[PDB]
Ligand binder design. Structure first.
Ligand code: CL
Ligand code: CL
Ligand code: CL
Ligand code: CL
Length: 379
């Protein structure tokens, strides 16, 4: 008929919103009457999969042992035969050895999505693109990743399909903010009343740029403001104490405060006026940029990686040079001077418009189903 079985394989390394993409695609396939299956190593992911009632198969990946690769490939192949899987969809960092073997032996098709920029040995690039990816397609989550696949992997262009990352415009919707839930968030985060709020929703790791923003906000010690740094502070705790100290030694403890991860990030966007991505090493895509644009905010992102891909400079947001405190401090100062004006409103409106028109989760999900149909054409 027109109903498909899509088996997604998720690895232990999940940088780049890999688990979020896998769950949203599974849920979408369910609604359309398709059958999603997810093979994972287990962990916290299974909890959501059970909530959404999606068939999950635990399995232990080990790319270091050929016997395990061959035996996992057999297990997957038997899963394929069991559920008449039409496509195996891998989102692994290295080549998905076991999954590739499973599809080579069965009628299933092989789809790869690259959620980031990783390197493969130069000796392997010829074999990968010529033999392994013959008659196959690959998905890049950004044009920044697609460029890597072209210049580094030397993968043929007509193999690469870009499916930009999407933001749930139904969840990230300023029309859902209530004046009460906002006040509760200002009360939870010690937010002052009549000052601009700067939100940096970044994991507390070194390459995110926290240090650059703190040196930038020090250059604006004369302006009144309040900066919130919300994100995990556990994976790199050594770095967190380092930042909190720099804020202290610069006597900025009352204008910048660090908080653990935010349960409901939507109310934190709603209370903010300026969102910051200050990464000094490139990112495949700037999730918080798109999320901030969806919330009708003034967005400032470093011009590096895919983080500026969603920003039409001076129209839906602003670019800054990475690792440049003065350039960042001046852009933040500029936004202060236009907050409240018709221009800010224009940019803020334009920002959510461009996310609805080009970077919605809805369009991401549909682009995934299209590439499934292309892969399954002539069957
Ligand atoms: Cl995806
Ligand atoms: Cl993107
Ligand atoms: Cl959406
Ligand atoms: Cl890391």
């Amino acid at each position: 008929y027109n109903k498909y079985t899509i088996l997604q394989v998720v690895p232990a390394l999940v940088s780049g919103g890999v688990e979020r993409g896998t769950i949203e695609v599974a849920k979408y396939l369910k609604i359309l009457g398709h059958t999603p299956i997810i093979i994972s190593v287990g962990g916290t992911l299974v909890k959501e999969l059970d909530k959404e009632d999606i068939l999950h198969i635990e399995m232990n990946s080990n790319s270091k042992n050929p016997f395990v690769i061959l035996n996992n490939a057999k297990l997957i192949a038997e899963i394929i035969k069991k559920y008449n899987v039409d496509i195996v969809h891998t989102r692994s960092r290295a080549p998905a050895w076991s999954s590739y073997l499973a599809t080579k032996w069965t009628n299933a098709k092989f789809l790869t999505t690259f959620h980031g920029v990783y390197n493969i040995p130069n000796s392997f690039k010829k074999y990968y693109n010529s033999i392994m990816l013959k008659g196959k397609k690959v998905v890049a989550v950004s044009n920044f990743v697609k460029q890597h696949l072209l210049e580094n992997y030397k993968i043929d262009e007509d193999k690469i399909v870009v499916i930009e990352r999407g933001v749930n415009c139904d969840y990230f919707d300023p029309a859902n903010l209530t004046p009460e839930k906002l006040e509760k968030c200002c009360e939870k985060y010690d937010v002052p009343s009549n000052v601009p709020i700067i939100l940096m929703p970044s994991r507390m790791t070194s390459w995110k740029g926290h240090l650059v923003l703190v040196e930038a906000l020090s250059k604006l010690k004369h302006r009144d403001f309040y900066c919130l740094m919300v994100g995990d502070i556990s994976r790199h705790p050594n770095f967190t104490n380092r930042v909190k100290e720099l804020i202290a030694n610069l006597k900025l403890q009352n204008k910048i405060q660090i908080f653990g991860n935010d349960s409901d990030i939507i109310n934190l966007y709603g209370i903010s006026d300026i969102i910051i991505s200050a990464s000094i090493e490139p990112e495949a895509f700037g999730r918080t940029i798109i999320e901030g644009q969806a919330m009708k905010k003034l967005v400032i992102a470093t011009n590096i990686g895919g983080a500026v891909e969603t920003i039409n400079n001076n129209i839906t947001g602003f670019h800054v040079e990475p690792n440049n405190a003065e350039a960042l401090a001046q852009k933040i100062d500029y936004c202060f001077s236009i907050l409240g004006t018709d221009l800010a409103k224009k940019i803020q409106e334009a920002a959510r418009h461009t996310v609805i028109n080009n970077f919605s989760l809805n369009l991401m999900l549909r682009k995934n189903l299209e590439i499934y149909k292309e892969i399954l054409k002539n069957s």
